[PDB]
């Protein structure tokens, strides 16, 4: 479900995509991301909340 696809301002979640596989994952792991940037390029990034 993505808010941006439909009501971006509202923040309401509307399904935009479906996964064909019937099996549903029982576990989820966030993948850590590090920006590859020089000291001047370094910038703050918005937090992600689960």
């Amino acid at each position: 479900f993505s808010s941006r696809y439909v009501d971006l301002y509202g923040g309401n979640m509307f399904q935009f995509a479906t996964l064909p596989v019937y099996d549903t994952i029982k576990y989820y792991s966030i993948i850590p991301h590090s920006i590859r940037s020089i000291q001047s390029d370094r910038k703050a990034w918005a937090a992600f909340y689960v």
Partner: antibody
Amino acid sequence: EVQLVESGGGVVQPGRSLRSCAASAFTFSNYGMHWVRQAPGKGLEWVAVIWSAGSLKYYADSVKGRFIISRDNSKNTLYLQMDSLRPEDTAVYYCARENTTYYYETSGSWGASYYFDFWGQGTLVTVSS
Amino acid sequence: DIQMTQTPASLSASVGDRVTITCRASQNISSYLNWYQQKPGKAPKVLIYDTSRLQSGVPSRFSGSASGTDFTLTISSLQPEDFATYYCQQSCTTLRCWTFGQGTKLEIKR
């Protein structure tokens, strides 16, 4: 301050099993330990290479299972097993960790990321007749 | 695997004279090529790791330049203590071949 030593080296008969290397003042689990054999008049080659996990063991093409590597990270010691020993096989064995230079060149950005310090002194095994 | 033969089995170098040692691989399989100097009774020391950046603790006079498969190491003002047997090994994750150096020994000219 890191100490690397090889133990269990001794004169042996042909077709014999000889058990190695030990690391002191260092964390064995973080760095993979690799055994290198040097023969006089010849270049050093890594007969046995062991990953830090120890799940994957790498054997040189020259040795057909002659060298078997088992490492105890908690013990901080790497055990090398030698079988079907031969006069030609006789050589000095050095154990040292090996590292490579991995980096992303966003702006010609390169990191050496190398540790070759505390290279093993080496041990000599011989066949006597 | 890879078959590597150094062009000179032994090299004679006079003190204060520039000399070149060339090791030729069967092919340049990987970008990283390591040249090492070995002293008997002493642990091996790598002169260069990839032939593009000099290893720390190695004299600036040593230079590694590779043309085609062959790799040439240049020594300037060579000294008896500086002189050592040289082994070149192709460096890649896909080792196992464990290619090694034939060994070139430098002797003072007198």
